Design an enzyme around this catalytic site. Structure first.
Site, short mmCIF file in Angstrom:
data_model
loop_
_atom_site.label_atom_id
_atom_site.label_comp_id
_atom_site.label_asym_id
_atom_site.label_seq_id
_atom_site.Cartn_x
_atom_site.Cartn_y
_atom_site.Cartn_z
CD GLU A 1 10.09 22.91 9.45
OE1 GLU A 1 9.80 23.76 10.33
OE2 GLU A 1 10.76 23.19 8.44
CB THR A 2 5.65 20.08 8.99
OG1 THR A 2 5.64 20.87 10.20
CG2 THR A 2 4.22 19.85 8.54
CG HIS B 1 -21.35 -0.59 4.51
ND1 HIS B 1 -21.24 0.78 4.52
CD2 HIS B 1 -22.37 -0.88 5.35
CE1 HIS B 1 -22.14 1.30 5.33
NE2 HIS B 1 -22.85 0.31 5.84
CG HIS C 1 -5.54 2.63 -1.03
ND1 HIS C 1 -5.21 3.96 -0.90
CD2 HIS C 1 -6.83 2.59 -1.43
CE1 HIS C 1 -6.26 4.70 -1.21
NE2 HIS C 1 -7.27 3.90 -1.51
CG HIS D 1 -11.40 3.91 1.00
ND1 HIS D 1 -12.35 3.89 0.01
CD2 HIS D 1 -10.22 4.15 0.38
CE1 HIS D 1 -11.77 4.09 -1.16
NE2 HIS D 1 -10.48 4.27 -0.96
CB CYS D 2 -16.61 1.63 2.86
SG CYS D 2 -18.19 1.02 2.24
CG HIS E 1 4.72 20.18 13.73
ND1 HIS E 1 6.03 20.44 13.38
CD2 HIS E 1 4.51 20.81 14.92
CE1 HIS E 1 6.60 21.17 14.33
NE2 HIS E 1 5.70 21.42 15.26
CG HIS F 1 2.36 23.20 11.72
ND1 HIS F 1 2.17 24.53 11.40
CD2 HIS F 1 3.21 23.18 12.77
CE1 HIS F 1 2.86 25.28 12.25
NE2 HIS F 1 3.49 24.48 13.09
CG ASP G 1 -10.28 0.52 -2.62
OD1 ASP G 1 -9.15 0.03 -2.64
OD2 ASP G 1 -10.57 1.54 -3.30
CG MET H 1 -17.58 3.48 6.59
SD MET H 1 -18.73 2.34 5.83
CE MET H 1 -17.97 0.76 6.21
CG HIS I 1 -20.47 4.60 2.22
ND1 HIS I 1 -20.89 3.41 2.78
CD2 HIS I 1 -21.56 5.15 1.64
CE1 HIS I 1 -22.18 3.24 2.52
NE2 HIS I 1 -22.61 4.27 1.83
CU LIG Z 1 -19.63 1.83 3.55
CU LIG Z 2 -9.01 4.61 -2.28
CU LIG Z 3 4.81 25.01 14.64
#
Ligand SMILES: [Cu+2]
Ligand SMILES: [Cu+2]
Ligand SMILES: [Cu+2]
Ligand SMILES: [Cu+2]
Ligand SMILES: [Cu+2]
Ligand SMILES: [Cu+2]
Ligand SMILES: [Zn+2]
Ligand SMILES: [Zn+2]
Ligand SMILES: [Zn+2]
Lengths: 335, 335, 335
Positions: free
Chosen positions: B272-273, B88, B93, B128-129, B248, B299, B91, B143, B138
């Site tokens: 709303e969303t 594993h 971001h 994430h891995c 939502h 939603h 990363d 992950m 993964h």
């Molecule tokens: Cu992994």
């Molecule tokens: Cu990424």
């Molecule tokens: Cu709704």
């Protein structure tokens, strides 16, 4: 207090029209009274006779657009006639509490209820039915529409300058999940209840059989095309209660767009294509500069052209050669 | 220089909680030390006993949320115990260089590594891995989690006014791809390695079998519902490392939302969303005004109700009849 | 008036490069003349010899990027050689009227046409072929590219401060729908016309067989990786004419991003992952701070790694230990 305010009664109109209303208003807050009646019915949704066991507010997909101003109170009477088979309710995304009002509007066939809520946030907001344990089915079968809450001083650009529309249209886009039999033909069901199990199976694949504007492939075309004139600003309200879409006006633009649909936020300008999140309504302004027939569509072009998510706008006026000119018509390639 | 700065050590907490932290702070930059331990395990992901051969940071889906301030340095020790089968890495971001740190954190079972990076950009960021040649597997197996980098002076509205939350929750949404056998039942695998080939085939269809908050259908419901009180502002962090979602709050709104999750940008109001791009984390603030049980969901209502992407928030306090009132309870339609 | 203005002629270059141009310019409006020639051809799109009966502007997927300034006029000669089988045209999302110019550019094999339009809105805009009754097929088979309309005074940040790029790349992302036979192998068609029926069936499932940058799995990798240096600001134009994507630079960010692609709107900063709506082009700036090989991908990681939507950027320069440092290399867990 809402019980101190004057009341007004609004008569709703069928999509794609929107009922008469003011934008910027001198009026103060009111309780605005609406009524809608649920109609379950079998509807023909394409050119080959495919049917949907549909569910509607007021007999239409989408339901009618309700327009109020920020600070107004919406008072809806929701009527579920004895001729219907299912219980229903209503969830206003524009509302605060009780799952949007769904908890207070549970109506069995033969019953009605009246809900009031404060429209304290400006924007276009989805409303939809949400009966416990069958929410997605009621929504995808047609039970959604838009509440538009206009700011009291009307629409504004990012610099706070005034914006307006001369004409408003409302488009509801519906991802449909019609089952097929062993023969590969779409199934036709005698009743709404009978369509349920097969429909849930299709839903779970996340692949719509059809995606339609306003209840049917080609609903907004031919005699039913939307209309405008060069010089006119049109508001295009687009609701999608369940699934993402990406509206685009072919040969046009979104001059000012609230894609998330909330008017207190500055709009973006000059959009080619915008994005309506599933479970929301957005709004775009466009001022026509060229005459002719435009298409208004979901710019997943498969969804538009193969599955049904496309309409037309027929526009009158004078061609502008400054904006666009055919310099050389199609002709043999010179030798 | 990071080697000049004081160090602090943070004890992580399991989702949906987030470890204690300050928002606006008087403190200067620090090296903030975290440790996480990888656990591969078979997990039950629905009410019918379906299992996932899962992979986790710290035994949970999502992994825990790490919180620092802009200008701080994140120093993570990543531990891959000998009880695990796979290599594993991680990363971030939120990080700059070496594929987010993945190139510097390749750990075989029985190994650990320590990575430092400058948290020089404010926002919620996915980590994430990403092991070479098996990145999507993964990630979809569990992950991922969120790094929140708060601005040193806390959150701000579009006018630069202060914003805050009184309570924070972290929700990771996981599109799962569980294979089925000839009998149509979900497969149960003796080992993680054995699940691989069949799982890749399902992934390639782009159709999740399940979409769950925090590792299981109904993870954030019942005894495990999130909680708040009228008057309290809640931050809802939503991460989706692989696939788009549209959060939502039913009966609520996103009062202030950074849907792309980056705090130096002005938030949008009254949503709303909202929309979380696959491969990102976003953040919404809401101040509760009504008591009762809310749903917090994706939603796409099929994804929510059929596939599992929905949770609950139980809210205490006093009902406000000004915001919403049942004028007429459901009753027979008058003759 | 366009007929009063000086003309210039531009020589287009193949993606991922973009033809030489100025950003902020002292020049006034011009009629900018371009020519493109349609080429239908069978293309190999993956490592296992799968072919696509493709359709291209200028022999490439995407077609070349055309760059003008706001207020300029685009004058395109579109040539459809007699060696082609199908009629074609062009719809510029950057243009106003006649379905983006499609109505004025209908060219049968052996014909050409010349269209002029005013580039009166700044941004990156999709252009694509749209022949009546076969629009989605022509688009998904490869017939799209980007028109970039730079503001006359160049790019600006949200505070109106100047922004620029030192290098520009153009990436077109193509959701492909290659049919399979009874044996489960991809079909190879003798002609373009023969591929049609089977391809429409795949399209209607909304599940791409491949999703590729610039015409092929791995098109922007190896000898064909994009390139930069620490200290250089790169513009990454991303077009997707049919389907949503979510670009992400692994180990990097979107420093300034117009995800809806329209430069009169303020950009967002510090993005991990952005969103390109199907039927649009967006634009991101990034200034490199670390050397090494980056991946530029659609962060639906299945779409990237399994289906082909991923490229590489090889970056030269000096490692910065302040931004990121391996404190402890992978080593046995201490006893
Ligand atoms: Cu992994
Ligand atoms: Cu990424
Ligand atoms: Cu709704
Ligand atoms: Cu209903
Ligand atoms: Cu064509
Ligand atoms: Cu188009
Ligand atoms: Zn007007
Ligand atoms: Zn508070
Ligand atoms: Zn530069």
């Amino acid at each position: 207090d809402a019980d101190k305010l004057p009341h007004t009664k609004v008569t709703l109109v069928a999509p794609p029209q929107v009922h008469p209303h003011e934008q910027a208003t001198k009026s103060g807050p009111k309780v605005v009274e609406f009524t809608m009646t649920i109609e379950e019915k079998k509807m023909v949704i394409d050119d080959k006779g495919t049917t949907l066991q549909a569910m509607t507010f007021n007999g239409s997909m989408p339901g009618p657009t309700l327009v109020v101003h920020e600070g107004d109170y919406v008072q809806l009477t929701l009527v579920n006639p004895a001729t219907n088979a299912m219980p229903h309710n209503v969830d206003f995304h524009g509302a605060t509490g009780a799952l949007g009002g769904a908890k207070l509007t549970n109506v069995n066939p033969g019953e009605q209820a009246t809900l009031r809520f404060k429209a304290d946030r400006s924007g276009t907001f989805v409303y939809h039915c949400a009966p416990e344990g069958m929410v997605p089915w009621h929504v995808v079968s047609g039970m959604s529409g838009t509440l538009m809450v206009l700011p009291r001083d009307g629409l504004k650009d990012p610099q706070g300058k005034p914006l307006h529309y001369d004409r408003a249209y409302t488009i509801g886009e519906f991802d449909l999940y019609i089952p097929k039999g062993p023969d590969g033909k779409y199934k036709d069901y005698a009743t709404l209840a009978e369509s349920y199990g097969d429909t849930v199976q299709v839903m779970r694949t996340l692949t719509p059989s059809h995606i339609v504007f306003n209840g049917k492939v080609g609903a907004l075309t031919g005699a039913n095309a939307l209309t405008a004139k060069v010089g006119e600003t049109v508001l295009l309200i687009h609701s999608q209660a369940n699934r993402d879409t990406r509206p685009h006006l072919i040969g046009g633009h979104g001059d000012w767009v609230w894609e998330t649909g909330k008017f207190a936020n500055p709009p973006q300008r000059d959009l080619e294509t915008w994005f309506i999140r599933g479970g929301s309504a957005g709004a775009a302004l466009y001022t026509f500069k060229q005459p002719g027939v435009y298409a208004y569509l979901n710019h997943n072009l498969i969804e538009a052209f193969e599955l049904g998510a496309a309409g037309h706008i027929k526009v009158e006026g004078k061609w502008n050669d400054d904006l666009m000119k055919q310099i050389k018509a199609p002709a043999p390639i010179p030798r």
